[PDB]
Coordinates of C-alpha atoms and ligand atoms in Angstrom, one line a residue:
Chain W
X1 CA 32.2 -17.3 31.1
X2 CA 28.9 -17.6 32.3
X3 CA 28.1 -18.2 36.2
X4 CA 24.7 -19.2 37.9
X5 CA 24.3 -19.2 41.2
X6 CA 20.4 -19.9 42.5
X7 CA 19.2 -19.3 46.5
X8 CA 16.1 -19.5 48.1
X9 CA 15.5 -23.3 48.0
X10 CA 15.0 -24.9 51.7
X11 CA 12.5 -26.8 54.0
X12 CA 8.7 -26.0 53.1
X13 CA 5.8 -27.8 54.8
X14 CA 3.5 -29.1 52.7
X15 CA 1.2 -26.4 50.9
X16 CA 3.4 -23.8 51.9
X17 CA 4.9 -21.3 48.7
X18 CA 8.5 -20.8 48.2
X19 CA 10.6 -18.3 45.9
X20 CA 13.7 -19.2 44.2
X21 CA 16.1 -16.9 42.0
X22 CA 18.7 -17.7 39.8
X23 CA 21.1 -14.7 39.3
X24 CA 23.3 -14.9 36.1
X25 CA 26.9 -12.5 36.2
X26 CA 30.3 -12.5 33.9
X27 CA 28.2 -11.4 30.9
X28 CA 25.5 -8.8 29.6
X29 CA 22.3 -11.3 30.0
X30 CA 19.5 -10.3 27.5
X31 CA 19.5 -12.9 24.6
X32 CA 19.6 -16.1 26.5
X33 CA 17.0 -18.7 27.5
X34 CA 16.6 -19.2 31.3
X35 CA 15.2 -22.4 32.2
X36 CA 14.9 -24.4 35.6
X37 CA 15.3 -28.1 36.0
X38 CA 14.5 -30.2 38.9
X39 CA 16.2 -34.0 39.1
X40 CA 14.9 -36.2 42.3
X41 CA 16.3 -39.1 43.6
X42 CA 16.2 -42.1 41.7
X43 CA 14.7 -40.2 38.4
X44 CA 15.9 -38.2 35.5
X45 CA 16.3 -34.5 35.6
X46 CA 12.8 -33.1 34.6
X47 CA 12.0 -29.3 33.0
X48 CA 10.5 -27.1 35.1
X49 CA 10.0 -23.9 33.7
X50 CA 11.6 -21.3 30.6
X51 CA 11.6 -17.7 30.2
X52 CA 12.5 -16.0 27.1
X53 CA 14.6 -13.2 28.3
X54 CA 14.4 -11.2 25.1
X55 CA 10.6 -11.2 24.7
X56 CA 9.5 -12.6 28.2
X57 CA 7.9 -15.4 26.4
X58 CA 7.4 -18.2 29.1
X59 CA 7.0 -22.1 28.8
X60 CA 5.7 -24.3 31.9
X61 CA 5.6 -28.1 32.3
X62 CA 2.4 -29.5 33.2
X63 CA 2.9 -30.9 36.1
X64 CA 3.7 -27.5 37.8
X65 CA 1.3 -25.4 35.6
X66 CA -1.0 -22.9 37.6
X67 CA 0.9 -23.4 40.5
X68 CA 4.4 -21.7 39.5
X69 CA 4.8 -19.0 37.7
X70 CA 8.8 -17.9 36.8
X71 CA 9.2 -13.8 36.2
X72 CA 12.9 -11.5 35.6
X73 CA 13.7 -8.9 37.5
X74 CA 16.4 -7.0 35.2
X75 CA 17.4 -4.6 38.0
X76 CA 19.9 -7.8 39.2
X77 CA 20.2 -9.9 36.2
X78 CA 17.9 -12.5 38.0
X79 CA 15.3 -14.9 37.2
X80 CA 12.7 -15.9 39.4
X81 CA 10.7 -18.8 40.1
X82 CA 7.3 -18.4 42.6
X83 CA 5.7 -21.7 43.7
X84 CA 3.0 -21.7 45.3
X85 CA 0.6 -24.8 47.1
X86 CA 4.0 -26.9 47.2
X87 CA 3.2 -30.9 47.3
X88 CA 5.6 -33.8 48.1
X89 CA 5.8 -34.4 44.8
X90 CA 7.8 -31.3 44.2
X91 CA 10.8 -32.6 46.1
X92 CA 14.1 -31.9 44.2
X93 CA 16.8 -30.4 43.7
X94 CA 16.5 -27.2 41.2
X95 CA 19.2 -26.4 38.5
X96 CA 19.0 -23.3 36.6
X97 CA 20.4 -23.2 33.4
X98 CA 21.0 -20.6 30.5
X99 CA 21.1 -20.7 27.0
X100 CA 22.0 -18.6 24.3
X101 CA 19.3 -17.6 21.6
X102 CA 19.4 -19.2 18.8
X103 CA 17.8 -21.1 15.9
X104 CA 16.0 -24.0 16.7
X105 CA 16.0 -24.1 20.5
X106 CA 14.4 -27.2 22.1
X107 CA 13.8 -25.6 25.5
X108 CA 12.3 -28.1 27.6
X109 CA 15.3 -30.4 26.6
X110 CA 18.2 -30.4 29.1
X111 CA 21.0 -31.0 26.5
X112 CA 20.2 -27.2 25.4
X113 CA 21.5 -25.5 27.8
X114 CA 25.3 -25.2 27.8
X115 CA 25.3 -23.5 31.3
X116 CA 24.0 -25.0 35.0
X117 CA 23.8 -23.9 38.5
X118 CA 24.8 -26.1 41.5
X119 CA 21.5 -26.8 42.3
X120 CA 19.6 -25.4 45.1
X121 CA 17.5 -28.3 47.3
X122 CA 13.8 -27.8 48.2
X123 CA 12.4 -30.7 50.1
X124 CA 8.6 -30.4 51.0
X125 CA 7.6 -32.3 54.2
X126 CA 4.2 -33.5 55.1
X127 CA 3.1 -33.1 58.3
Chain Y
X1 CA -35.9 -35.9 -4.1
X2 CA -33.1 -33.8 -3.3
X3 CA -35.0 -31.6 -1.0
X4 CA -34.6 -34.5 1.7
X5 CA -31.1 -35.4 1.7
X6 CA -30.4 -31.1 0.8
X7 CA -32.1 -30.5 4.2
X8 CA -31.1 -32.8 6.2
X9 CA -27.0 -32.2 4.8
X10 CA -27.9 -28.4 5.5
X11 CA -29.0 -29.2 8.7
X12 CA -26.2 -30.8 10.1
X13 CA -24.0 -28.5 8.3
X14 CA -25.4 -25.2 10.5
X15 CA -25.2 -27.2 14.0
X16 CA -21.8 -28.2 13.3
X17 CA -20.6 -24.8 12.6
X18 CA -22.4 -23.4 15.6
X19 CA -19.8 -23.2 17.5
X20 CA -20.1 -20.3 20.6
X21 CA -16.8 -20.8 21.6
X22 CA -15.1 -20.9 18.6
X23 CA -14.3 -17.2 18.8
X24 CA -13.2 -17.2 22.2
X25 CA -10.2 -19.9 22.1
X26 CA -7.3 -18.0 23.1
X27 CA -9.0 -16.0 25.9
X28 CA -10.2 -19.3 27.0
X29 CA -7.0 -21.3 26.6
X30 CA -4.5 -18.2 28.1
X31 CA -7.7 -18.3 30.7
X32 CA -7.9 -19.0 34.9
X33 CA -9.8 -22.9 33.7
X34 CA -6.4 -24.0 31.5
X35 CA -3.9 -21.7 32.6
X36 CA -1.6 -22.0 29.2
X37 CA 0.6 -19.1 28.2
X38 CA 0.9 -17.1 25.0
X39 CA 4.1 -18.8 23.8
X40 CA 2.9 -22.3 24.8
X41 CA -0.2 -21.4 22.4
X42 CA 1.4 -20.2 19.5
X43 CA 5.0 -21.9 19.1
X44 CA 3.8 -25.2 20.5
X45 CA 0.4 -26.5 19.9
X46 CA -1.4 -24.3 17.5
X47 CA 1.5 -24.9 14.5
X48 CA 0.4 -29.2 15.3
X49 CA -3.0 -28.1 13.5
X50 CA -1.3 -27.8 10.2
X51 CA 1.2 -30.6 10.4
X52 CA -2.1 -32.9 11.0
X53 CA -4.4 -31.1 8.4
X54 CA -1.1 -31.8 5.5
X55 CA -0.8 -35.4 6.6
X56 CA -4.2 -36.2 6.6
X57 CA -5.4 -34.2 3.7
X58 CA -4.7 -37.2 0.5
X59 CA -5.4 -40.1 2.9
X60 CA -8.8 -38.7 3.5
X61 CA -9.2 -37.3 0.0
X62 CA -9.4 -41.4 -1.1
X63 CA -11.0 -42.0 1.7
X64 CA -13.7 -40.0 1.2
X65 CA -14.2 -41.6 -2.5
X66 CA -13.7 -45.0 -1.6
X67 CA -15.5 -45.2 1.6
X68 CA -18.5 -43.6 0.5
X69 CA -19.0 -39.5 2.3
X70 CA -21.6 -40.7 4.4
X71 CA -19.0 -42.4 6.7
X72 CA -16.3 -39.9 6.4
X73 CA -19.2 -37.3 7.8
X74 CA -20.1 -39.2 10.6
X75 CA -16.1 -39.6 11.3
X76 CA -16.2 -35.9 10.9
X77 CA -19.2 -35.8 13.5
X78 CA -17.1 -38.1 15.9
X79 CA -14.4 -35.9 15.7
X80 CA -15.9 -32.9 16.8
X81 CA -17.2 -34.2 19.4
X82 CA -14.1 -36.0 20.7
X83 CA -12.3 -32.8 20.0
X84 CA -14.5 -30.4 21.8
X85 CA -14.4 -33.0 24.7
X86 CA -10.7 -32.9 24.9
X87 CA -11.2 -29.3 24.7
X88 CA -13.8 -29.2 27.6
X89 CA -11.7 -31.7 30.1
X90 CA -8.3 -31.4 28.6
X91 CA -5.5 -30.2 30.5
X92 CA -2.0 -29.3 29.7
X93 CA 0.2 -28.9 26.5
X94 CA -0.3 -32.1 25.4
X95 CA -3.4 -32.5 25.6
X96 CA -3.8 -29.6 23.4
X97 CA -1.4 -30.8 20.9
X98 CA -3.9 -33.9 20.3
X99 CA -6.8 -31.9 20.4
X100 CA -5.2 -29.6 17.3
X101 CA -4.8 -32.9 15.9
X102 CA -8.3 -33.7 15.9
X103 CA -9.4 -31.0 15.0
X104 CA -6.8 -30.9 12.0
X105 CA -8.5 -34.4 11.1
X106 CA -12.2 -32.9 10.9
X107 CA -10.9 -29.9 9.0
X108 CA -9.4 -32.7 6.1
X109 CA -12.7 -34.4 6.8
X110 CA -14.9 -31.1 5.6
X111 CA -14.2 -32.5 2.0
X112 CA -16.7 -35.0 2.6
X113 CA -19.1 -32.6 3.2
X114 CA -19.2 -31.0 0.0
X115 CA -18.3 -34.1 -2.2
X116 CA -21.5 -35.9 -0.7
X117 CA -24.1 -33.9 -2.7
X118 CA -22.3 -35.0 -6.5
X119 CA -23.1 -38.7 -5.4
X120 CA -26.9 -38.1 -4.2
X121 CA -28.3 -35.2 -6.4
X122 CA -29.1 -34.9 -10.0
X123 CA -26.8 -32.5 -11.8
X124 CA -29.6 -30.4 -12.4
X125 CA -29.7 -29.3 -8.8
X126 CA -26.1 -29.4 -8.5
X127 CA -25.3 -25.6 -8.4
X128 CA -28.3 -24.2 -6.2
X129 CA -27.9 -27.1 -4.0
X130 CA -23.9 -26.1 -3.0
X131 CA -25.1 -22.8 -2.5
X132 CA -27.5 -23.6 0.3
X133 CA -24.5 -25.8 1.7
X134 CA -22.5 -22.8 1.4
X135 CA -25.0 -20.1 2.3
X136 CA -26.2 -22.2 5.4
X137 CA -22.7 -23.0 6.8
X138 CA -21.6 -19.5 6.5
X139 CA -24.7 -18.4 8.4
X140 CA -24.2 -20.6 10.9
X141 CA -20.9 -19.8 12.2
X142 CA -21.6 -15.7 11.6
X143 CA -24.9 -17.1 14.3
X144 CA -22.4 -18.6 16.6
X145 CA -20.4 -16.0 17.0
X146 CA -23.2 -13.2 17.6
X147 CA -24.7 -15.3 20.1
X148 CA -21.0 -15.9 22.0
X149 CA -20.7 -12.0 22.3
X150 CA -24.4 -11.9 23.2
X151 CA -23.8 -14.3 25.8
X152 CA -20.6 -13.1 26.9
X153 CA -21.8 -9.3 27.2
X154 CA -25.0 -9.3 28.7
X155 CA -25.6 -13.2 30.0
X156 CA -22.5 -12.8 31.7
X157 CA -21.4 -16.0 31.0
X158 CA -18.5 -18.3 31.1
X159 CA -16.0 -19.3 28.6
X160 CA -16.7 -22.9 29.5
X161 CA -20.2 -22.6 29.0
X162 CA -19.5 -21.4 25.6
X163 CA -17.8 -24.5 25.3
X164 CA -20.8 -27.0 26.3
X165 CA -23.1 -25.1 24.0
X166 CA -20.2 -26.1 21.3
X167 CA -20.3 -30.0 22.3
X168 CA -24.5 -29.8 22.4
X169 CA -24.5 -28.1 18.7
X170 CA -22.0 -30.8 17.2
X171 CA -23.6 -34.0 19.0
X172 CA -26.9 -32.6 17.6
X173 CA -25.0 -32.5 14.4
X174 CA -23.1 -36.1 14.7
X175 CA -27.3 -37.0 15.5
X176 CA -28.6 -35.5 11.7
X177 CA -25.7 -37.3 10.3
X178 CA -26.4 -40.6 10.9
X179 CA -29.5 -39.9 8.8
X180 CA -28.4 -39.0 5.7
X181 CA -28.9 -41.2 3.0
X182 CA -25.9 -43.6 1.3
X183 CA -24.5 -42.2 -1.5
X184 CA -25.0 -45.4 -4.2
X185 CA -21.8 -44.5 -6.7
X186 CA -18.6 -41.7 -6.2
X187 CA -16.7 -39.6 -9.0
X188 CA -13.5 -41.8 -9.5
X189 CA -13.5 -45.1 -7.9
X190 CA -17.5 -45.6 -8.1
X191 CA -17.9 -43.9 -11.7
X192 CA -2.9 -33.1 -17.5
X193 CA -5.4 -29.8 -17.2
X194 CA -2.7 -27.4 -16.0
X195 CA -1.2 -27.7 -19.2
X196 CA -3.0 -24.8 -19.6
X197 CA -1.1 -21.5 -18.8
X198 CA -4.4 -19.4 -17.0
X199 CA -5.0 -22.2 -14.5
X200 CA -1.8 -23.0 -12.9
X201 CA -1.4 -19.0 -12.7
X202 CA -4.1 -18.4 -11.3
X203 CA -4.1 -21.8 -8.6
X204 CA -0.8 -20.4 -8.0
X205 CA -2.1 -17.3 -6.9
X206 CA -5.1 -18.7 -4.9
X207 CA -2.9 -21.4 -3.0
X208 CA -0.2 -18.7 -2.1
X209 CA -3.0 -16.7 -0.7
X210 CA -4.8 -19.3 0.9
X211 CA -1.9 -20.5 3.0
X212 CA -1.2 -16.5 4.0
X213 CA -5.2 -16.0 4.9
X214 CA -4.9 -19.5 7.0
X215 CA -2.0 -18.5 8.4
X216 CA -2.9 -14.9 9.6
X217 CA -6.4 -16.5 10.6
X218 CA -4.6 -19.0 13.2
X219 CA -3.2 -16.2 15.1
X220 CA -5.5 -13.2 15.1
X221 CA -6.4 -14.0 18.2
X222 CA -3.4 -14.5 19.7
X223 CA -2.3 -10.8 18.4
X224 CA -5.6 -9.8 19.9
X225 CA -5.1 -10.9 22.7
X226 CA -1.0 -9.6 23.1
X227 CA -2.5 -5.9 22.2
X228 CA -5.7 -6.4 24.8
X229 CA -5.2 -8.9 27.5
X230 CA -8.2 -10.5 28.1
X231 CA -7.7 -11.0 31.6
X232 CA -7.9 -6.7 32.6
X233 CA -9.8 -5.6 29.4
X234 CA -13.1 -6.1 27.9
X235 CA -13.1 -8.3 24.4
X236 CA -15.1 -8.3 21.4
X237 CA -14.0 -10.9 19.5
X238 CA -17.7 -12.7 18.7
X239 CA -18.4 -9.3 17.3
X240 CA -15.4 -8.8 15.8
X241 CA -15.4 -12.5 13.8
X242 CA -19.1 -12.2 13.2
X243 CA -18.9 -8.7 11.4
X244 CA -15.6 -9.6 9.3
X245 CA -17.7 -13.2 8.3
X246 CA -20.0 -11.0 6.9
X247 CA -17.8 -8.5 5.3
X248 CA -16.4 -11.3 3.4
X249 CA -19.5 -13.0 2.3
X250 CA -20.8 -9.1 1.3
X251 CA -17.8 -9.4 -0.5
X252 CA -17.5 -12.4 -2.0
X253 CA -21.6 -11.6 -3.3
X254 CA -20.6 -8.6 -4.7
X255 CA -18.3 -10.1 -6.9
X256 CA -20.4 -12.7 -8.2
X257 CA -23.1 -10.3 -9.0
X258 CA -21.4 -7.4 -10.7
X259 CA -19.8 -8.7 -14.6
X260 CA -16.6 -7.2 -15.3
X261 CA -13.7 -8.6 -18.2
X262 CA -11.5 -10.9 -15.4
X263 CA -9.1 -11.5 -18.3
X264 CA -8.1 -8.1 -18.3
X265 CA -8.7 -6.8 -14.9
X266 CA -8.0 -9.7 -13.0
X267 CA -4.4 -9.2 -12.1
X268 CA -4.5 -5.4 -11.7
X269 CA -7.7 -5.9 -9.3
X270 CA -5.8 -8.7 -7.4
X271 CA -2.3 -7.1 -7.2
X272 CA -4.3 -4.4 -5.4
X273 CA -6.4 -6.4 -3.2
X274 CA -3.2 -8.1 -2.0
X275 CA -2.0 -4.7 -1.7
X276 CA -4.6 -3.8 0.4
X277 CA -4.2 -7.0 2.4
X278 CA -0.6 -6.3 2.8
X279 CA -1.5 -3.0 4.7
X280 CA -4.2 -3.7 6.5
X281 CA -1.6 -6.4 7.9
X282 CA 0.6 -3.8 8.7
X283 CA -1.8 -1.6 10.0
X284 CA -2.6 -4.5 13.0
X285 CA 1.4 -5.2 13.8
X286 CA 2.1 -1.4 14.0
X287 CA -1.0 0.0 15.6
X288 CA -0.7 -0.2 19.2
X289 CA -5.0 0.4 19.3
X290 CA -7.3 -2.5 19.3
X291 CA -9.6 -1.1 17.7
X292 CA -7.5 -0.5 14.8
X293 CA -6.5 -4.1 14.8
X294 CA -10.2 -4.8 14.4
X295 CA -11.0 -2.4 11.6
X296 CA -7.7 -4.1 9.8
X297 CA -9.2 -8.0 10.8
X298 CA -12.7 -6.6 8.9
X299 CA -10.5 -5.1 6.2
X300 CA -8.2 -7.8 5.3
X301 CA -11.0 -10.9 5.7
X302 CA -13.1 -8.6 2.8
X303 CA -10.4 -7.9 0.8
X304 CA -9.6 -12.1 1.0
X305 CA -12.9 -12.4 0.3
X306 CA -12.4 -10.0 -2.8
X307 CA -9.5 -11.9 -4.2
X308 CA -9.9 -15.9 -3.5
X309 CA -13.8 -15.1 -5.0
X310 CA -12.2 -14.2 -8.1
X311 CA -9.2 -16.7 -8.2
X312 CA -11.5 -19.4 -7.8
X313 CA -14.0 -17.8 -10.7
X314 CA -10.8 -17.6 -13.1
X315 CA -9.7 -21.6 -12.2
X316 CA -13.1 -22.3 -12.6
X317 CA -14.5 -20.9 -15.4
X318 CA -13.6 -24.1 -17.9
X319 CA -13.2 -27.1 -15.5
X320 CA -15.8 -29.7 -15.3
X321 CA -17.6 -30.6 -12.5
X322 CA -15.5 -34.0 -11.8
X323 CA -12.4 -32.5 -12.3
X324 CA -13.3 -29.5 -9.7
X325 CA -12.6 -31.9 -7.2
X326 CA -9.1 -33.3 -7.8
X327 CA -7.6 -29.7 -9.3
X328 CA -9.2 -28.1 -5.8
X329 CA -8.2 -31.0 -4.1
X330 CA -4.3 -30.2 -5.7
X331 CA -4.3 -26.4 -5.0
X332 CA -5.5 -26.8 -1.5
X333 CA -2.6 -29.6 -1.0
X334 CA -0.2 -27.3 -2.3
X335 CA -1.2 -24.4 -0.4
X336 CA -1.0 -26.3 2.8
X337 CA 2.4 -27.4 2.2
X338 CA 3.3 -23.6 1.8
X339 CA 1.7 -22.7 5.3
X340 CA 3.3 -26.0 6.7
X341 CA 6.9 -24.8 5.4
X342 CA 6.3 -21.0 6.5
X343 CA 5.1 -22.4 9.9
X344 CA 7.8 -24.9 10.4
X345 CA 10.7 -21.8 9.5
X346 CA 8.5 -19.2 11.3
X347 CA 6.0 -20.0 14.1
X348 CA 7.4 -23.3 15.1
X349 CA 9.6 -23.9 18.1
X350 CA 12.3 -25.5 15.9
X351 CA 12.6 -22.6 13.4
X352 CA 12.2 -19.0 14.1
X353 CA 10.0 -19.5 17.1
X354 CA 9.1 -15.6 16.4
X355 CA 6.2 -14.0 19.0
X356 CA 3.1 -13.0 17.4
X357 CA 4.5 -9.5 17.7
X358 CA 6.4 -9.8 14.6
X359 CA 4.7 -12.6 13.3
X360 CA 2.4 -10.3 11.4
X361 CA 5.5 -7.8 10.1
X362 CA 6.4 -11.4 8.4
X363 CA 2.8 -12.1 7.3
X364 CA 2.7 -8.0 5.5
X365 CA 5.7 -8.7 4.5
X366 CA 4.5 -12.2 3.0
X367 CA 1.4 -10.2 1.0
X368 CA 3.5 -7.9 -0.2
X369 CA 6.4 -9.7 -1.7
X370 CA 3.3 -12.2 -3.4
X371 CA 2.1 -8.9 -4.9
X372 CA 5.6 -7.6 -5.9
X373 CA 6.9 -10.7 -8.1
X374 CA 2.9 -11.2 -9.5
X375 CA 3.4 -7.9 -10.6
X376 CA 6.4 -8.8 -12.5
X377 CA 6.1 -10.3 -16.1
X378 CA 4.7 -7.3 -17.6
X379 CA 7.1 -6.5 -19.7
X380 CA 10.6 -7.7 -22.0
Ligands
LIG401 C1 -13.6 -21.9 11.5 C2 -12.3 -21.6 12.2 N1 -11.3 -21.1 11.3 C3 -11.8 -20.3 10.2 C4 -12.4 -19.0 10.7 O1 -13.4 -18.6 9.9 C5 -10.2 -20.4 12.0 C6 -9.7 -21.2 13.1 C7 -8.4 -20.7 13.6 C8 -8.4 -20.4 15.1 C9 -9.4 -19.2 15.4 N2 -9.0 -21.5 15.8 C10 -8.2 -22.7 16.1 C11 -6.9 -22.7 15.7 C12 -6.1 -23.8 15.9 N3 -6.7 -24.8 16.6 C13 -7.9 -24.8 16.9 C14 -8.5 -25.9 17.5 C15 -9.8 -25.9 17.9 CL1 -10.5 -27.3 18.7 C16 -10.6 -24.9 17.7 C17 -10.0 -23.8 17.0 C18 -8.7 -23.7 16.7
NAG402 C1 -5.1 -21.8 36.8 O1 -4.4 -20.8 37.5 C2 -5.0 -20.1 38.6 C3 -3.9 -19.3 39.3 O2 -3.2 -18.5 38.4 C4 -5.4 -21.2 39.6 O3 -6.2 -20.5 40.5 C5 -6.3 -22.2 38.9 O4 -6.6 -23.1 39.9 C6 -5.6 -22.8 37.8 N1 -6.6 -23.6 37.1 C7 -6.3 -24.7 36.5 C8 -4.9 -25.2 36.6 O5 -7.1 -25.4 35.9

């Protein structure tokens, strides 16, 4: 059985950066998709970012593109997520989630992934 | 009487393929001004160009003969201007999904382009009349390009500048079109062939290797780019485009010019040239150096050139000028649906979803195998 377990979300002032990772354990990790979410209150769970771990290909929603930029660091079975000029927009809580490579994959869909973390919060307050 | 509307079609013709920027797409869309990534590019909004270009292809076809060409250029016009607009002050994925869409929809539009002299000029002038369309066009993109690498080596200038020059050259374009004058009557709606063995093999042949030569052409660039980043290396690819352009057109004149017995020859010289294009494929997935990735571009665009030249002689050496249109009109149907299906299982986020890194091991492979069972028949 999979397990993902993210840290590093917290209380950012507005503008500020912020670096969350996602470490995966109870398997090898090198053929699966690893994609963060975000879900606010009162809205839908939204894609965030995707990273191929196989090739390194990587996928970014628009409203976060040029601004966050998601990387692996193999030596921990992690994934990382860098944002950078935070807005209060980007208030959320942040699931990441793992799929296994596969024909057709949707990855920005949320019903692909079989695997979620408990969510680590970032709230971005505005001075 | 044809000199005016020749000139003034030729004219708008060469500023609507001078495009600067054309070259430089991928360094300017994987660039610091849109910020998309090499996946996003390849497996998500480049594959929408074909999708659009099948489903628009018979629409306009009928289009363009009912509505007269005239209008179906100046839609053309309107498109390339709308879609280097998007282009200019489009951001995001989606953005770039409809602006492959529009530009799908000018490149089903090009039809009208070369339909639109039948309807205005005597047959007489028929023949040396396409040839200046043809020569002219070609020109005028090999143009474009020198002057991007001119501009982007020594000017020193920006991608997005490259751009604006790209908007200015097809508004002036859009502006000739709206002078050109109305065609009064069209082939079929203003007036069984491949019954005949020769033509649907050799249509066979030149839509199989049309979709493989549009296919490797979409993502050049994007193998250019995986092998020499843009963003820490310095780039040729004006240069690069501009001397395989004229490779193939060097190529494509040569064969016109020298008479040899294509009954005979044909498949021998074309099971080599897609040979050749097989390897110089492989040469660019294997090679790790860009400038052997270049030298394999220039090879396989001539060798292309050396085989669809004499496909299209072989199809075309009985067919009348009428039926030119509709049998052309068939094979380059046919051969879209072939890229459209090897996209969809390949390239597209819903198949495959491969990397360009072994999209071109697919592509050799593609040459190759259309070389193998061509080769078959011979005997038994
Ligand atoms: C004349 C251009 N052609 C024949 C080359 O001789 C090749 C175009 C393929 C690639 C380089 N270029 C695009 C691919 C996909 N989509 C695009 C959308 C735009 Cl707006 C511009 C360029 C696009
Ligand atoms: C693109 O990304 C760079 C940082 O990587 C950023 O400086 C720039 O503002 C972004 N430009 C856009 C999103 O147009």
């Amino acid at each position: 059985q999979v397990q993902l377990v993210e840290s590093g979300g917290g209380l950012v002032q507005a503008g500020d950066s912020l670096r969350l990772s996602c470490a995966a354990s109870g398997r090898t990790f090198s053929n699966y998709y690893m994609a963060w979410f975000r879900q606010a209150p009162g809205k839908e769970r939204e894609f965030v970012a995707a990273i191929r771990l196989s090739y390194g290909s990587t996928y970014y929603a628009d409203s976060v593109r040029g601004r966050f930029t998601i990387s692996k660091d193999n030596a921990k079975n992690t994934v990382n997520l860098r944002m950078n000029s935070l807005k209060s927009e980007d208030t959320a809580i942040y699931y990441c989630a793992a799929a296994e490579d596969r024909w057709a994959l949707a990855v920005r869909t949320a019903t692909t992934y079989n695997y979620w973390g408990q969510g680590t919060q970032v709230t971005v307050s505005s001075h | 009487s044809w000199i005016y509307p020749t000139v003034i079609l030729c004219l708008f013709g060469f500023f609507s393929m001078m495009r600067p920027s054309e070259p430089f797409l991928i360094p300017y869309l994987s660039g610091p001004d849109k910020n998309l990534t090499s996946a996003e590019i390849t497996n998500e909004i480049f594959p929408v160009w074909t999708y659009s270009y099948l489903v628009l292809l018979l629409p306009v076809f009928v289009l363009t003969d009912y509505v007269r060409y005239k209008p179906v250029i100046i839609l053309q016009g309107i498109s390339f201007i709308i879609t280097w607009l998007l282009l200019l002050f489009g951001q995001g994925v989606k953005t770039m999904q409809v602006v492959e869409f529009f530009y799908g929809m000018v490149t089903a539009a090009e039809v009208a382009y070369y339909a639109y002299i039948y309807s205005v000029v005597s047959p007489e002038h028929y023949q040396r009349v396409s040839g200046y369309c043809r020569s002219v066009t070609l020109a005028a993109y090999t143009a474009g390009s020198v002057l991007a690498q001119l501009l982007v080596s020594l000017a020193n200038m920006s991608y997005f500048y490259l751009n604006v020059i790209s908007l200015a050259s097809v508004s002036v374009a859009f502006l000739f079109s709206l002078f050109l004058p109305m065609p009064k009557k069209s082939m079929f709606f203003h007036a069984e062939c491949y019954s005949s063995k020769r033509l649907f093999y050799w249509s066979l042949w030149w839509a199989f290797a049309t979709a493989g030569f549009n296919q490797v052409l979409n993502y050049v660039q994007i193998l250019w780019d995986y092998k020499a980043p843009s963003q820490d290396s310095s780039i040729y690819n004006g240069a690069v485009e501009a001397i395989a352009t004229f490779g193939g057109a060097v190529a494509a004149f040569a064969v016109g010019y020298v008479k040899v017995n294509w009954d005979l020859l044909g498949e021998l010289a074309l099971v080599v040239f897609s040979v050749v294009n097989a390897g110089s494929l492989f040469l660019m997935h294997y090679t790790a150096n860009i400038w052997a990735c270049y030298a394999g571009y220039l090879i396989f665009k001539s060798s292309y050139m050396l085989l669809i030249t004499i496909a299209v002689f072989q199809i075309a050496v009985n067919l009348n000028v009428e039926r030119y249109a509709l049998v052309f009109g068939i094979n380059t149907f046919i051969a879209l649906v072939i890229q459209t299906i090897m996209t969809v299982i390949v390239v597209d986020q819903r198949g495959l979803n491969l990397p360009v890194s072994i999209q071109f091991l697919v592509y050799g492979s593609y040459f190759a195998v259309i070389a193998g069972i061509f080769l078959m028949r011979s005997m038994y």
